[PDB]
Enzyme design. Structure first.
Site, PDB file in Angstrom:
ATOM      1  N   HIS A  30     -69.600  39.495  -4.587  1.00  0.00           N
ATOM      2  CA  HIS A  30     -68.137  39.523  -4.638  1.00  0.00           C
ATOM      3  C   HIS A  30     -67.599  40.805  -5.249  1.00  0.00           C
ATOM      4  O   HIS A  30     -66.392  41.043  -5.196  1.00  0.00           O
ATOM      5  CB  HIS A  30     -67.593  38.311  -5.407  1.00  0.00           C
ATOM      6  CG  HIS A  30     -67.812  38.364  -6.895  1.00  0.00           C
ATOM      7  ND1 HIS A  30     -69.028  38.079  -7.483  1.00  0.00           N
ATOM      8  CD2 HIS A  30     -66.956  38.628  -7.916  1.00  0.00           C
ATOM      9  CE1 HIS A  30     -68.915  38.175  -8.798  1.00  0.00           C
ATOM     10  NE2 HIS A  30     -67.668  38.503  -9.089  1.00  0.00           N
ATOM     11  N   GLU A  54     -74.435  35.122  -3.911  1.00  0.00           N
ATOM     12  CA  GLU A  54     -73.822  36.178  -4.700  1.00  0.00           C
ATOM     13  C   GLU A  54     -74.817  37.243  -5.133  1.00  0.00           C
ATOM     14  O   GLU A  54     -74.455  38.135  -5.903  1.00  0.00           O
ATOM     15  CB  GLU A  54     -73.112  35.586  -5.919  1.00  0.00           C
ATOM     16  CG  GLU A  54     -71.739  35.023  -5.588  1.00  0.00           C
ATOM     17  CD  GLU A  54     -70.828  36.071  -4.986  1.00  0.00           C
ATOM     18  OE1 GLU A  54     -70.724  37.180  -5.553  1.00  0.00           O
ATOM     19  OE2 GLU A  54     -70.212  35.789  -3.940  1.00  0.00           O
ATOM     20  N   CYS A 130     -69.361  41.783 -13.766  1.00  0.00           N
ATOM     21  CA  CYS A 130     -70.254  41.228 -12.758  1.00  0.00           C
ATOM     22  C   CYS A 130     -71.075  42.326 -12.084  1.00  0.00           C
ATOM     23  O   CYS A 130     -70.640  43.472 -11.955  1.00  0.00           O
ATOM     24  CB  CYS A 130     -69.460  40.422 -11.729  1.00  0.00           C
ATOM     25  SG  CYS A 130     -68.993  38.822 -12.392  1.00  0.00           S
TER      26      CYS A 130
HETATM   27  C1  FHR Z   1     -67.192  38.959 -12.584  1.00  0.00           C
HETATM   28  O1  FHR Z   1     -66.604  39.227 -11.533  1.00  0.00           O
HETATM   29  C2  FHR Z   1     -66.697  37.769 -13.403  1.00  0.00           C
HETATM   30  C3  FHR Z   1     -67.364  37.633 -14.794  1.00  0.00           C
HETATM   31  C4  FHR Z   1     -66.921  36.363 -15.616  1.00  0.00           C
HETATM   32  C5  FHR Z   1     -65.223  36.326 -15.803  1.00  0.00           C
HETATM   33  C6  FHR Z   1     -64.991  35.658 -16.884  1.00  0.00           C
HETATM   34  N1  FHR Z   1     -66.240  35.911 -17.820  1.00  0.00           N
HETATM   35  C7  FHR Z   1     -67.420  36.369 -16.835  1.00  0.00           C
HETATM   36  O2  FHR Z   1     -68.521  36.648 -17.200  1.00  0.00           O
HETATM   37  N2  FHR Z   1     -67.017  36.637 -12.543  1.00  0.00           N
HETATM   38  C8  FHR Z   1     -66.022  35.625 -12.198  1.00  0.00           C
HETATM   39  O3  FHR Z   1     -64.922  35.679 -12.658  1.00  0.00           O
HETATM   40  C9  FHR Z   1     -66.472  34.525 -11.244  1.00  0.00           C
HETATM   41  C10 FHR Z   1     -66.002  34.859  -9.827  1.00  0.00           C
HETATM   42  C11 FHR Z   1     -66.673  34.036  -8.699  1.00  0.00           C
HETATM   43  C12 FHR Z   1     -66.106  34.528  -7.362  1.00  0.00           C
HETATM   44  C13 FHR Z   1     -66.842  33.931  -6.152  1.00  0.00           C
HETATM   45  C14 FHR Z   1     -68.365  34.057  -6.256  1.00  0.00           C
HETATM   46  C15 FHR Z   1     -68.893  33.510  -7.577  1.00  0.00           C
HETATM   47  C16 FHR Z   1     -68.196  34.197  -8.753  1.00  0.00           C
HETATM   48  N3  FHR Z   1     -65.924  33.237 -11.645  1.00  0.00           N
HETATM   49  C17 FHR Z   1     -66.172  32.764 -13.002  1.00  0.00           C
HETATM   50  O4  FHR Z   1     -66.827  33.384 -13.783  1.00  0.00           O
HETATM   51  C18 FHR Z   1     -65.634  31.370 -13.388  1.00  0.00           C
HETATM   52  C19 FHR Z   1     -65.015  30.466 -12.525  1.00  0.00           C
HETATM   53  C20 FHR Z   1     -64.731  29.299 -13.304  1.00  0.00           C
HETATM   54  C21 FHR Z   1     -64.105  28.054 -13.029  1.00  0.00           C
HETATM   55  C22 FHR Z   1     -63.979  27.112 -14.053  1.00  0.00           C
HETATM   56  C23 FHR Z   1     -64.460  27.384 -15.336  1.00  0.00           C
HETATM   57  C24 FHR Z   1     -65.063  28.608 -15.607  1.00  0.00           C
HETATM   58  C25 FHR Z   1     -65.198  29.567 -14.564  1.00  0.00           C
HETATM   59  N4  FHR Z   1     -65.744  30.824 -14.581  1.00  0.00           N
END
Ligand code: FHR
Ligand code: FHR
Length: 162
Positions: A30, A54, A130
């Site tokens: 992503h 991912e 990420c």
């Molecule tokens: C990198 O892009 C971030 C890193 C996270 C953000 C917050 N702290 C981190 O380490 N990744 C995300 O935000 C993912 C995005 C997803 C998009 C589609 C593919 C898989 C990854 N989402 C989360 O980290 C996330 C979603 C979520 C829902 C409910 C509770 C917690 C939570 N965390």
């Protein structure tokens, strides 16, 4: 980790990626810039891009990082292994984070299928983190096991190859 290891971590779109070997770059799917024409000066059509949920591998047609040795890449770590999440920040600050790796699973996160291994952090991860790699030391060998993809308030998700 030595400077050689940290130098493999490079900003990539909205996150980071990691040079496993001179021609192989891994990142979280992503994070990859959409509508990019080239990566590292190579037109995108010449790059072999393979997505496993991912976890994304980018294989370049000619070596890009001739200075690096090929590192061992495996699908996660044995349960209980304390890996290091090698976080780089846009300021340049290095933030290694210890994470005890737990069960492997495939689950949906925000509507997307993610195969990987969950970990528990032992000062956290943020939205720009990420693609940073999870690594651990096995004997005298460094092993990279996946890329950072998600976290909750101390669960972290390391996406792994399929
Ligand atoms: C990198 O892009 C971030 C890193 C996270 C953000 C917050 N702290 C981190 O380490 N990744 C995300 O935000 C993912 C995005 C997803 C998009 C589609 C593919 C898989 C990854 N989402 C989360 O980290 C996330 C979603 C979520 C829902 C409910 C509770 C917690 C939570 N965390
Ligand atoms: N169950 C849940 O609701 C939580 C929610 C999860 C917490 C961490 C940040 C993303 C959302 N999901 C999880 O624990 C989870 C573990 C796991 C392992 C591999 C692949 C995907 C995974 N998802």
């Amino acid at each position: 980790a030595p400077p050689s290891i940290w130098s493999r971590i490079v900003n990539f779109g909205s996150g980071w990626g990691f040079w496993v070997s001179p021609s192989l770059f891994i990142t979280s799917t992503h994070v990859i810039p959409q509508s990019a024409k080239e990566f590292f000066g190579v037109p995108i059509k010449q790059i072999q891009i393979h997505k496993s949920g991912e976890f994304c591998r980018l294989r370049f047609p000619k070596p890009i990082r001739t200075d690096v040795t090929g590192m061992i890449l495996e699908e996660g770590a044995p349960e209980g292994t304390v890996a290091t999440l090698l976080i780089k920040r846009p300021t340049g600050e290095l933030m290694p984070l210890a994470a005890r790796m737990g069960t492997h699973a495939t689950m949906k996160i925000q509507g997307r299928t993610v195969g990987g291994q969950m970990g528990m952090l032992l000062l956290g991860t943020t939205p720009g983190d990420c693609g940073c790699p999870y690594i651990y030391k096995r004997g005298n060998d460094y092993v990279v096991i996946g890329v950072h993809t998600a976290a909750a308030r101390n669960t972290v998700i390391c996406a792994t190859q399929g």
